[PDB]
Amino acid sequence: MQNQQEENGSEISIEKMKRYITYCRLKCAPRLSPQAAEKLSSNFVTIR
Amino acid sequence: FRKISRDRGIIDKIISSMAPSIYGHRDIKTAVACSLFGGVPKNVNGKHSIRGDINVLLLGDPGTAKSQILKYVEKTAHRAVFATGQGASAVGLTAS
Ligand SMILES: Nc1ncnc2c1ncn2[C@@H]1O[C@H](COP(=O)(O)OP(=O)(O)OP(O)(O)=S)[C@@H](O)[C@H]1O
Ligand SMILES: [Mg+2]
């Protein structure tokens, strides 16, 4: 069933995951949008 | 091997064959036979690995012939390596 899910595309192989993780760590580094900081602030202060 | 395996009570005979010098410890002999024979170790899809060999713990009071059973397993098994914790004249358990 795992081979079937890998062939269907619902799962990827472990080596493909390894190379994808290396590629994403090497290439991408996101920033928070200015609209996304206010909700983070509100949720962080309500809990405290 | 095939002629002796097709008997119905072969397994019992194997339990009777473990440590003839040891008397009355039938469950220990069964555990020793299971450890010597062992299961199959499997690795499904590469990602998940299941161990396939039986680890046995002989807990006992002094004078219950556990050491003699260990020497029998040493004599019987293809690759049996004996180690001890308190003793010194033996191969260690630590890679170095
Ligand atoms: N059921 C048994 N059948 C045959 N011999 C036995 C049995 N129980 C004890 N013995 C004998 O009693 C002695 C005990 O020796 P050991 O195997 O060294 O004891 P032990 O199980 O290692 O326990 P320790 O060494 O005190 S921690 C040996 O001479 C055994 O042959
Ligand atoms: Mg002993």
UniProtKB/Swiss-Prot annotation, chain A:
Any further remark recorded for this protein: Present with 10300 molecules/cell in log phase SD medium. Early fractionation of eukaryotic MCM proteins yielded a variety of dimeric, trimeric and tetrameric complexes with unclear biological significance. The MCM2-7 hexamer is the proposed physiological active complex.
The protein's assembly and partners: Component of the MCM2-7 complex. The complex forms a toroidal hexameric ring with the proposed subunit order MCM2-MCM6-MCM4-MCM7-MCM3-MCM5; loaded onto DNA, forms a head-head double hexamer. Interacts with CSM1.
Cellular localisation: Nucleus
Stated name of the protein: Minichromosome maintenance protein 5
Stretches assigned to coiled coil: none
Name of the coding gene: MCM5
Similarity annotation: Belongs to the MCM family.
Superkingdom of the organism of origin: Eukaryota
Free-text function comment from the UniProt entry: Acts as a component of the MCM2-7 complex (MCM complex) which is the putative replicative helicase essential for 'once per cell cycle' DNA replication initiation and elongation in eukaryotic cells. The active ATPase sites in the MCM2-7 ring are formed through the interaction surfaces of two neighboring subunits such that a critical structure of a conserved arginine finger motif is provided in trans relative to the ATP-binding site of the Walker A box of the adjacent subunit.
Swiss-Prot record, chain B:
Transmembrane segments: none
Effect noted on mutating K66A: Reduces MCM2-7 complex helicase activity. Abolishes MCM2-7 complex helicase activity. Reduces MCM2-7 complex helicase activity
Residues at which ATP binds: G60, D61, P62, G63, T64, A65, K66, S67
Disulfide bonds: none
Domain of life: Eukaryota
Location in the cell: Nucleus
Anything else known: Present with 1690 molecules/cell in log phase SD medium.
General function of this protein: Acts as a component of the MCM2-7 complex (MCM complex) which is the putative replicative helicase essential for 'once per cell cycle' DNA replication initiation and elongation in eukaryotic cells. The active ATPase sites in the MCM2-7 ring are formed through the interaction surfaces of two neighboring subunits such that a critical structure of a conserved arginine finger motif is provided in trans relative to the ATP-binding site of the Walker A box of the adjacent subunit.
Family: Belongs to the MCM family.
Quaternary structure and interacting proteins, as annotated: Component of the MCM2-7 complex. The complex forms a toroidal hexameric ring with the proposed subunit order MCM2-MCM6-MCM4-MCM7-MCM3-MCM5; loaded onto DNA, forms a head-head double hexamer.
Protein name in UniProt: DNA replication licensing factor MCM2
